[PDB]
Amino acid sequence: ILGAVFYIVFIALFFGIAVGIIFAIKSI
Amino acid sequence: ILGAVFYIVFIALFFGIAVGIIFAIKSI
Amino acid sequence: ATLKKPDLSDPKLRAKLAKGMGHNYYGEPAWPNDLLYVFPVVIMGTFACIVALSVLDPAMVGEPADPFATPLEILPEWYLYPVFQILRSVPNKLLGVLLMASVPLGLILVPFIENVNKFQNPFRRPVATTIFLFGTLVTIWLGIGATFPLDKTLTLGLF
Amino acid sequence: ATLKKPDLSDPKLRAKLAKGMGHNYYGEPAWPNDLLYVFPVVIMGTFACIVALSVLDPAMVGEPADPFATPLEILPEWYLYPVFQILRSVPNKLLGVLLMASVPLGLILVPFIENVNKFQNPFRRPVATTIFLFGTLVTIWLGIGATFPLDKTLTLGLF
Amino acid sequence: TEEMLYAALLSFGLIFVGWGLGVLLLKIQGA
Amino acid sequence: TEEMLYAALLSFGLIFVGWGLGVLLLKIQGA
Amino acid sequence: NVYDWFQERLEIQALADDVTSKYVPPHVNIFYCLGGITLTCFLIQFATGFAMTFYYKPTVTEAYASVQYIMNEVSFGWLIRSIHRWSASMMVLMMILHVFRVYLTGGFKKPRELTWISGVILAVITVSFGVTGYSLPWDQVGYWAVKIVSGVPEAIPVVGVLISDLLRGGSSVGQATLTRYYSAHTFVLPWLIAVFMLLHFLMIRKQGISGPL
Amino acid sequence: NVYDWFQERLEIQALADDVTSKYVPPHVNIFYCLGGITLTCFLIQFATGFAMTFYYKPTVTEAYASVQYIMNEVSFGWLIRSIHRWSASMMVLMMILHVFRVYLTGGFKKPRELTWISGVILAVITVSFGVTGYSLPWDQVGYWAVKIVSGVPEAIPVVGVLISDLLRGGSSVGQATLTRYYSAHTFVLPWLIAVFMLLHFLMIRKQGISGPL
Amino acid sequence: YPFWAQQTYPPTPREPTGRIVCANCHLAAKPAEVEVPQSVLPDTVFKAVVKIPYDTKLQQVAADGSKVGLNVGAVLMLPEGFKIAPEERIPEELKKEVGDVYFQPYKEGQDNVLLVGPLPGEQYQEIVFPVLSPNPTTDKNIHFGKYAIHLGANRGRGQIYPTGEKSNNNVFTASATGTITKIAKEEDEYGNVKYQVSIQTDSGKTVVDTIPAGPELIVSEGQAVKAGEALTNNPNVGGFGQDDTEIVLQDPNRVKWMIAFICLVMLAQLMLILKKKQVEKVQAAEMN
Amino acid sequence: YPFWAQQTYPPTPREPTGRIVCANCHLAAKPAEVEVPQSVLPDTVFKAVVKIPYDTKLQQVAADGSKVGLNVGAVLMLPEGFKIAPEERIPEELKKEVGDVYFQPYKEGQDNVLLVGPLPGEQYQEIVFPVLSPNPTTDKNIHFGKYAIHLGANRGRGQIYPTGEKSNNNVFTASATGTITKIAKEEDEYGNVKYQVSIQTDSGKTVVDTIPAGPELIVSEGQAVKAGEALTNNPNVGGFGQDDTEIVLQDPNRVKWMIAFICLVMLAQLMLILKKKQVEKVQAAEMN
Amino acid sequence: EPLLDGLVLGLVFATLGGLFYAAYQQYKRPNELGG
Amino acid sequence: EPLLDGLVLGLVFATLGGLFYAAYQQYKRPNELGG
Amino acid sequence: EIDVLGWVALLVVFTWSIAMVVWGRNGL
Amino acid sequence: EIDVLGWVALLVVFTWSIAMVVWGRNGL
Amino acid sequence: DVPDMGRRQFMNLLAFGTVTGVALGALYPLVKYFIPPS
Amino acid sequence: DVPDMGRRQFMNLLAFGTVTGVALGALYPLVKYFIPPS
Ligand code: HEM
Ligand code: HEM
Ligand code: HEM
Ligand code: HEM
Ligand code: HEM
Ligand code: HEM
Ligand code: HEM
Ligand code: HEM
Ligand SMILES: CCCCCCCCCCCCCCC
């Protein structure tokens, strides 16, 4: 259960970083 | 001295074999 | 998506296509798209997973060798379970050795046996596919069997 | 004698000749004349000589290692005599190490130094040849020197 | 036989997560 | 320093013997 | 200029031209990585393998203690050996999956059967790596595993005992066995797998990938 | 037909065509064999070297006795070790003569300087083979020779002791040294010399022989 | 009993084959399990759960011949450095979970090998061990890494005593061959019950196989069936069992550094893919 | 003497460095050589020639101080299995060449290590050793192969006795520092000649360096030159010397098989060249 | 090593499934030169 | 190993001589493309 | 409970690798 | 005196090799 | 609209920089391994 | 005048036969080496 939460937060974090960087690079 | 004799006989032998085989193959 | 079609107006390519080749003359460019940008991802991915596994689940050190004490519960590594199951179950040892040798040697014959057919897609060749799935099933079955005691090794503790 | 002349009517060959290449496009055919019939002779000759030497003059077995007993008369193999002579004679150790390193590194510079000249024949380049012979002489000299005692190692028991 | 289960389910399952994720990024950029 | 002498003289000398021999065979066949 | 310097002599451009002339067709999916991942696992084995030769001692009195020494005393030794233990299993697994992808894509059929054969040979070589490696620690499992596998060939009627006696270096398992096995694990198999990987890769690069489905 | 079988797939004829397209010019005399003779000596080392790994034991308690065992008990072992002792010297000698022929024929000048460099590297590697091999018997000469050469790097002011400590695996010469040296002699140097010989030969086969005089 | 192992086998409970001397008297074979965390940080209290399951509503033959329940006992071999946690370092719920267990080391200076039992078999179907992990930082003889754990668990009465003589919880057999004639129970009021079984003819013969009382009987009268005939039936309903497992004495720095590395890898991968995406554009602006 | 080596060094004459204990008393250094065949067949008598050269017409200081010639002595270490040939297996000329040498083993069961001397230095400038090679066929502890031989040869009187005290064949030195005053030879008719040399002043001092008679003198009167001043000159004219060599205990089968192989090789080479010659013709018939 | 065995079985089944899926996907909609 | 040293010196001098002879031989009578 | 994060890491790299490989080559 | 023949052999192969190499390629 | 010369090198540096990071990170423990224990 | 097809194979056999001889001769002791001592 705990590991699942951590997993979600981890992938969500790096996913967010990805979607962040792409738009950061795109719209600039 | 002995080794020199042996050397001469050895090379002479194989030289003779060479000159032998060449003519044996050539003139046949 | 970065794509080059096959140049079917080039006899050199057609000659290869007829020979079952030339399939690296069309598609996306291998360099830099795949080789420079994607292969490293695979490498680092592999290395990363292996490192993580190594850290979390490091190698153990067993007890020193005793030639006068035969262990209980003695197995090889997983990829030898099927072979191991065969060798201990089959009474005739030479038969078992042959059966073992049959694995790589038989595999060497596969290409020559299936040259009858030209197809690649498993769906366009269901006999071979059936035999393959059967083989796989028997393999895993023997594999699991290797771990059970000799009594219930084949029956697998079922029938 | 089985000989093919250079085809100087072929731009591709001339382009190589200008670049200092294409020298394997003329002469006797490499196959089968040399590769199939002469190379084996060289191989078997080499092997034969080494075998004869091995039989007549087999390898010895020295006395076991004693870390508390430094041997008298302790040398490396011949190809290290010159280097060995340098290292023990030169008082400053770092200097000696540099002098040792100077051998392979200096050799690496040879091609770039002598690119000034295009000639290959030693007679058409007497400076380099003189320096080379000098080097060889100094090398053999040091080599022999390595075997003599440190007192007469350089003077070589002469002057 | 508990570590084996975890290993199996996860090694089999997270592949589809990664897959879907990749597809998701593809959809986000619009290929 | 006797084996060394033999080795030197012979290793240096017999090369010319082999050489001359080869030339001799060449002359015998007539190239 | 460096490029000109190299190009003047070795025609370096010939390489770059060949690498960029290659294309990857649409039917090449992720499973086509499995071959290259099997390789990646081997390079790791080569690195970590090599490293362990700097501390491991192939003697019945020295081995077990040397493994301990790598695990307990050598810097990151535990990590090196752990990687070497994992990446071997992974190599074998990725090789099996590679075989699956090859078979279920019909890439083994004409004109690529030599690649398949060299592959089978490679597999036998990798299993050999595994088996020989397994016994180097000279712990209980390794010793009793070697003692079992070494005896199998005896079933052959004419030349079985000879083969076994060659494998263990004698009638029984002992120092000779460990020696021969270590030689096999750290010298023979590397060169063999190298050669057959070279042939594998040359043939593949020669003919290219198999067609679509 | 076999030729057709192979030709259909790997275009075998491409090889034979390349081998027979090559010619050897008049200025190529007997001394041009020296390179190929240096190689022939190495292949012998590889064979006899490998063989001795089946009986040699790289431990301070086992080595000397194992060498004795090869000399006195192993079939033809004395011949194998003798060949290995002679053919090493011969390799180094033939390499020197090869260098003579190269220099005094100006084959090192443009555009073949990379071949020369790779050659120098090869020479350093061969000398390394020699040095590391020399101490494996772990007799008096070998031990005291290693003890001398290992200490040389200490003269470097910043990183000498590190280098030496890497070479002997510690502050003094002992088992670690023998281990590292054996690894070096039977694993590292073979792969290195292989690579650099490969490069040497590729460049030579690429550019061909140097011109006449 | 677990202490008879100490008595009969002072140095160690485990034999070089890994069989555990317990089996030398408890000849039956029932399952047994040991559960522990996959990893533990140094200087940490954790749970090691032994499991010795058996049909709770199933009784056995008592020493006198009665029908009493059965107790459980076990030996647990933990890695070097591991030991029972001090009563002060054990939390409430765990302390409650453990119970009135009397963990007993196998001998002086071997606190990692622990004997347990006899304990009530109904309440202790599983036995909780409160264990404190060692600390490589303070003990330089301890290292991080993976280590084995060995369980030897048992339920029910044994079949052989330390003296050598058998007990009344196993089958008995005939002597040679000859007519049986008697079935009695020449019981004293000092000693307990027995059972008489005679032999005769074939070669004289007049020997009697007087056996304890407890097992059943499947022999009536007048037979001669070799030597080894099961005439008493097997009354045993318990048995010994082994299980091995592994535990990782883990260093957190080791883990967190790994995590860092992984994050770096993922970052790098991401950047590479982004670069490819950047190139995908440039290439698309040169199609036609 | 060679036997004082046995006395002072029972186990072996050679030290782990390979120095030979002989040098511990014969402090001078003169050359020495040992010659043997490069190879020998098993069970064969052969010559091992020791050479201990020195200026024949050059005399040394005698024990009493006189001028007598000098004798030669040597220790020779041969490989295991080698020994002096039985007088019956030695031919005439060799037997004559050897002379009245009394080859003496270093100790019981060490017949390969042989002591020699003192022998007359004028006639034995070189010393012939008649040696019989071992036979691996009959002695399974002996193998064919290459083996070392160690020589330790000497001529002239030593400088130190087994008891420790010095002799009259080396330089003497002063004690500390102070005025010398005397040069006499307080000789008895029981003992031999001596030489008195005194010391004084600087710090009291009245010590005398009474030295044996034999060496020369380069000090007259009234000096004080530290401690170690060469005042006696070096009378030694001999010295110890070492030489090592190698011998091959050769198996003839080993040789003859090699010869066969070589012949085969030469045959093969010849045939290959002939084939090339055959091809040279075929190729020449397709030029133009 | 239960973990290993779990990984093996999981990856094997996943891989096989993926391969048959890849085959079927091309079976229904043949790419250019599909065959 | 005196034999080795003898072989070394002999072969070295012979080789050098042979090389200079080969150079001189071409020096006097240049082959085609001699240079 | 850093160990949990430890395993989660392995899982996340395993996932992310497939994710990035897929996104990279418009995966399958 | 088989040893003498033994060395003679070495000498004869050394000579004959050069001889055959030379004769083979019209040597130098 | 279109990425100029400078913007490419930025992504190059960004990617291969991190990759170099991972390379060094991976290569660092291997160097400490080969240095012998004191 | 000119050697026919058959006469070539004769020299082939003659040469490569002897070479094979030397190969086997050289290869034979190496096999006995790898068989362990009793
Ligand atoms: C260490 C073991 C092996 C390594 C490193 C390896 C490596 C590779 C690589 C990198 C490729 C390029 C294509 C790809 O990855 O999909 C490949 C293709 C191939 N492999 Fe392997 N392989 C190994 C074992 C095997 C085995 C066991 C087999 C068969 C039993 C095999 C048969 C093939 C075939 C037939 C191809 C070409 C298929 C096609 O063209 O579509 N290889 N291999
Ligand atoms: C150049 C290549 C390789 C070298 C130099 C090498 C070297 C070594 C060394 C020195 C050891 C002893 C250390 C130990 O016992 O842990 C070892 C063990 C081992 N090797 Fe390798 N290895 C190589 C490749 C491989 C490959 C390809 C595999 C399997 C595919 C493999 C499997 C093993 C195994 C299973 C062990 C023992 C495992 C253990 O100790 O727990 N090795 N290797
Ligand atoms: C997305 C990742 C990958 C894909 C799609 C893939 C697929 C392929 C394909 C289609 C081929 C055929 C080559 C040709 O037609 O010329 C091939 C060959 C090969 N690949 Fe991979 N693979 C991948 C990963 C890797 C990795 C990570 C490595 C090494 C680290 C590798 C090494 C090789 C080698 C050595 C060959 C030999 C055949 C050749 O050179 O053409 N691959 N692979
Ligand atoms: C194991 C060591 C070496 C081996 C096996 C080797 C092998 C070879 C071979 C077979 C050739 C073909 C031409 C010939 O044999 O004459 C060659 C050419 C060449 N070698 Fe080496 N060699 C070695 C070391 C060296 C060294 C030490 C140098 C320079 C210091 C060197 C520089 C060259 C050059 C420049 C060529 C081409 C010269 C030309 O084209 O005329 N090699 N080598
Ligand atoms: C794959 C290549 C090689 C392998 C596997 C190998 C292996 C071995 C082994 C196992 C030994 C120990 C046996 C002994 O001490 O005699 C040894 C010794 C030795 N090696 Fe090698 N070797 C190789 C190549 C070379 C080369 C190229 C040289 C020099 C150019 C060389 C020089 C030596 C020397 C001088 C000894 C000790 C000599 C002696 O014992 O008298 N080796 N080698
Ligand atoms: C008469 C005997 C020999 C002669 C005249 C000779 C001379 C040469 C020449 C001129 C080259 C230049 C190659 C080119 O231009 O393409 C060369 C290269 C080479 N040779 Fe030799 N050599 C001889 C013996 C040998 C032997 C016995 C071997 C191996 C057993 C050998 C192996 C090589 C190798 C590996 C190269 C690399 C360069 C290439 O492949 O072109 N050679 N040699
Ligand atoms: C070493 C681990 C051992 C464990 C964990 C163990 C466990 C037990 C337990 C729990 C009981 C009582 C069961 C009940 O009353 O229902 C028991 C009784 C008994 N054990 Fe053990 N035992 C061990 C070793 C041994 C040894 C070494 C012997 C003999 C040498 C032995 C022989 C017996 C016998 C004969 C009884 C019953 C005696 C009676 O009831 O009068 N066991 N054991
Ligand atoms: C081990 C080999 C030795 C040899 C071959 C050797 C040889 C000789 C010879 C030939 C002489 C007589 C020379 C002459 O009269 O001109 C001599 C005398 C002498 N030796 Fe040695 N010696 C050896 C060892 C020793 C040892 C071990 C010692 C003392 C421990 C020693 C101390 C002396 C002394 C003091 C004399 C002369 C004593 C006197 O003249 O009163 N030598 N030795
Ligand atoms: C099933 C693996 C057995 C490995 C036996 C190794 C024997 C040592 C010599 C190496 C031979 C390897 C041959 C592999 C084809």
Side-chain angles (χ1 to χ4, degrees), chain G residues 124 127-128 131-132 167 180 184 188-189, chain H residues 54:
Chain G
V124 176
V127 175
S128 307
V131 172
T132 55
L167 291 174
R180 294 197 175 197
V188 178
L189 292 171
Chain H
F54 258 53

Side-chain angles (χ1 to χ4, degrees), chain P:
Chain P
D1 180 32
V2 181
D4 57 273
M5 294 291 185
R7 300 187 183 278
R8 309 243 196 91
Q9 295 178 316
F10 182 73
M11 290 302 295
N12 277 5
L13 171 143
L14 251 295
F16 301 113
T18 48
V19 174
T20 298
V22 176
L24 295 168
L27 199 88
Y28 165 81
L30 192 66
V31 175
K32 296 305 304 305
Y33 174 97
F34 280 108
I35 301 170
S38 51

Side-chain angles (χ1 to χ4, degrees), chain C residues 3-4 16 19-32 34-35 42-44 46-47 50-51 53-55 57-71 74-80 84 87 93-95 97 100 103-112 114-122 124-125 128-129 131-133 136, chain G residues 19-28 33 36-37 40-41 44 64 67-68 71 78-79 81-90 92-93 96 99-100 102-113 116-117 120-121 124 126-127 129-131 134 138-141 143-145 147-149 152-153 155-157 204-213:
Chain C
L3 169 59
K4 170 180 172 183
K16 296 216 183 185
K19 258 288 178 59
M21 306 181 185
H23 294 289
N24 56 7
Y25 281 69
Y26 62 92
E28 67 171 5
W31 182 275
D34 256 34
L35 298 174
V42 180
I43 296 171
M44 299 166 94
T46 308
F47 186 67
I50 295 169
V51 164
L53 284 170
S54 303
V55 172
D57 206 335
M60 210 194 73
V61 177
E63 56 181 0
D66 190 343
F68 296 147
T70 307
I74 157 168
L75 266 65
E77 268 172 324
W78 59 276
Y79 53 85
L80 287 178
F84 175 66
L87 183 138
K93 299 186 174 185
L94 194 151
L95 206 199
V97 171
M100 284 177 54
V103 173
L105 299 178
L107 243 55
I108 283 174
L109 299 177
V110 173
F112 306 106
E114 297 195 42
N115 273 337
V116 161
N117 180 14
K118 203 198 308 305
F119 298 143
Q120 291 178 232
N121 196 314
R124 296 190 183 90
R125 45 190 181 102
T129 303
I131 298 165
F132 170 74
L133 264 46
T136 304
Chain G
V19 179
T20 59
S21 61
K22 296 292 183 296
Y23 292 83
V24 49
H27 66 267
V28 173
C33 300
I37 300 163
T40 302
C41 285
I44 294 171
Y64 185 88
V67 175
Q68 276 183 323
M71 292 297 293
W78 57 270
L79 214 194
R81 201 170 92 94
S82 301
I83 284 175
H84 199 88
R85 228 219 106 267
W86 271 113
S87 180
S89 308
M90 288 305 96
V92 180
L93 214 189
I96 294 167
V99 174
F100 288 169
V102 167
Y103 182 80
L104 294 181
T105 206
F108 66 90
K109 297 189 178 185
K110 176 172 184 176
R112 306 174 198 273
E113 47 241 43
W116 174 269
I117 292 171
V120 175
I121 299 167
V124 176
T126 310
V127 175
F129 260 114
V131 172
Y134 207 68
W138 208 249
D139 67 331
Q140 194 76 326
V141 180
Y143 180 93
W144 288 101
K147 193 157 180 177
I148 288 166
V149 299
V152 178
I156 284 81
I204 297 164
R205 180 57 74 189
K206 168 60 178 185
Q207 297 174 323
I209 192 67
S210 66
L213 308 187

Side-chain angles (χ1 to χ4, degrees), chain D residues 20 60 62 66 107 114 124, chain H residues 64 81 103 112 116 140 213:
Chain D
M60 210 194 73
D66 190 343
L107 243 55
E114 297 195 42
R124 296 190 183 90
Chain H
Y64 185 88
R81 201 170 92 94
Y103 182 80
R112 306 175 198 273
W116 174 269
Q140 194 76 326
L213 308 187

Side-chain angles (χ1 to χ4, degrees), chain D residues 12-120:
Chain D
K12 239 66 61 52
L13 178 59
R14 307 192 80 258
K16 296 216 183 185
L17 289 168
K19 258 288 178 59
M21 306 181 185
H23 294 289
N24 56 7
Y25 281 69
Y26 62 92
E28 67 171 5
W31 182 275
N33 297 33
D34 256 34
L35 298 174
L36 180 59
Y37 299 140
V38 183
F39 280 41
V41 180
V42 180
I43 296 171
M44 299 166 94
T46 308
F47 186 67
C49 290
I50 295 169
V51 164
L53 284 170
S54 303
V55 172
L56 303 177
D57 206 335
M60 210 194 73
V61 177
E63 56 181 0
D66 190 343
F68 296 147
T70 307
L72 323 178
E73 192 180 11
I74 157 168
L75 266 65
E77 268 172 324
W78 59 276
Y79 53 85
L80 287 178
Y81 287 172
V83 161
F84 175 66
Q85 175 54 37
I86 294 169
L87 183 138
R88 70 166 183 169
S89 57
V90 175
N92 185 287
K93 299 186 174 185
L94 194 151
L95 206 200
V97 171
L98 293 175
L99 285 168
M100 284 177 54
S102 303
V103 173
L105 299 178
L107 243 55
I108 283 174
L109 299 177
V110 173
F112 306 106
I113 292 167
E114 297 195 42
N115 273 337
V116 161
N117 180 14
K118 203 198 308 305
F119 298 143
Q120 291 178 232

Side-chain angles (χ1 to χ4, degrees), chain I residues 1 4-5 22 25-26 60 70-74 154 156-158 160-161:
Chain I
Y1 302 107
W4 279 342
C22 178
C25 297
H26 295 269
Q60 63 181 357
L70 50 156
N71 291 322
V72 297
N154 165 262
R157 301 175 63 229
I160 312 174
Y161 293 104

Side-chain angles (χ1 to χ4, degrees), chain C residues 59-60 77, chain G residues 42 45-46 48-50 52-53 56 67 70 81 84-85 88 91-92 126 129-130 133-137 182 185-186 190, chain H residues 187:
Chain C
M60 210 194 73
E77 268 172 324
Chain G
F42 170 81
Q45 292 296 117
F46 188 96
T48 54
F50 159 56
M52 287 197 297
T53 76
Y56 175 89
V67 175
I70 292 171
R81 201 170 92 94
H84 199 88
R85 228 219 106 267
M91 181 176 176
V92 180
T126 310
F129 260 114
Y134 207 68
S135 66
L136 294 175
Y182 183 73
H185 190 81
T186 55
Chain H
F187 187 92

Side-chain angles (χ1 to χ4, degrees), chain I residues 38 262 266 273 276-277, chain M residues 7 13 16 20 23-25:
Chain I
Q38 186 272 320
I262 266 58
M266 297 188 300
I273 300 305
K276 192 199 182 183
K277 254 52 174 150
Chain M
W7 287 100
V13 232
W16 189 254
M20 249 45 194
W23 183 25
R25 68 208 313 280

